[PDB]
């Protein structure tokens, strides 16, 4: 891991979003009918702040929030992240959000599968959890498309706007 | 938090086990018909090594493994622990093991409830998970006795001897 570390697939480049890409992150949200209701943090200065925070977590090795960029055009299509490592259990927490138009092209499955393979092959983790908002069906459908298994509807399972909400837990094992 | 931090209840003192208490930890395992099969790590030197490791985690603020001591006699009756914090979700992972004879006296409920209250009142966590070995029924019964709710049987949910095993997840919310 360095800030230069990328996961690259046939069509996509997974990497840190840079400070100079705040405009690109703003476009990604502004263009989506629905993302605004699921992503926590809409100003370019808010975009800048989010980018700076994500970098800090990456360099501190606490979380790896990858922007997902289309390799040909360099447009930002979404994000996939390792949100939290749980080293005691050789496990981690994943999150993601992909723009509506890019899911249609299979970018969500390509990006999230890249991250899952990195976790299992490279990091040698033996379990991953995805937590979906019960009201966000496309996010659930993507988890299932990547081979996740639904487990529980769990109370207080994740934070939105600093408050806790019931989330659906999906798992992946190698 | 300092190494001197204790949680004290009517009958029990929850605190770091010290290097000088290796003998006491050995007694606690040696006297139990069943603990040996559930606790991971039986030499006094092995006891010493485990004690040193637990201290490191406490001072690093990564985990808090409390020995549970009977206040009058100072005998070690078991342990309750915060195994992992999951700050992204304002949540933590708990574990525990209590000697057979001391469960009968309600020490397990008193110690584990003390830890749960510390997590909710003091740390302001909004969810705790307990993972039990499916074959360890007394540990499940104790989780339920402390007001936990059973959720999933989850594959690869915890490590024993560096290998993953299916565990039952219980939750507590405030």
TrEMBL record, chains A, B:
GO terms for molecular function: protein N-terminal-serine acetyltransferase activity; protein-N-terminal-alanine acetyltransferase activity. Gene3D superfamilies: 3.40.630.30. Residues 24-166 form the N-acetyltransferase domain. Pfam families: Acetyltransf_3. GO terms for cellular component: cytoplasm. PANTHER family: RIBOSOMAL-PROTEIN-SERINE ACETYLTRANSFERASE. This is Ribosomal-protein-serine acetyltransferase, putative. It comes from Vibrio cholerae serotype O1 (strain ATCC 39315 / El Tor Inaba N16961). The lineage of its organism: Bacteria, Pseudomonadati, Pseudomonadota, Gammaproteobacteria, Vibrionales.
């Amino acid at each position: 891991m360095t800030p230069d570390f990328q996961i690259v697939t046939q069509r996509l480049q997974l990497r840190l979003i840079t400070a100079d890409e705040a405009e690109e992150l703003v476009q990604c949200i502004r263009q989506s009918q629905t993302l605004h209701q699921w992503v926590d943090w809409f100003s370019q200065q808010e975009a800048e702040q989010f980018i700076q925070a994500t970098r800090l977590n990456w360099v501190k090795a606490e979380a790896y929030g990858f922007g997902v960029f289309e390799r040909q055009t360099q447009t930002l299509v979404g994000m996939v992240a390792i949100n939290e490592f749980y080293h005691t259990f050789n496990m981690a927490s994943l999150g993601y959000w992909i723009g509506d138009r890019y899911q249609r092209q299979g970018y969500g499955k390509e990006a999230l599968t890249a991250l899952i393979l990195f976790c299992f092959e490279r990091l040698e983790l033996t379990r991953l959890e995805i937590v979906c908002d019960p009201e966000n069906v496309p996010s659930q459908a993507l988890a299932l498309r990547c081979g996740a298994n639904r487990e529980q509807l769990a109370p207080n399972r994740f934070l939105y706007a600093g408050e806790p909400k019931a989330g659906i837990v999906f798992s992946l094992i190698p």
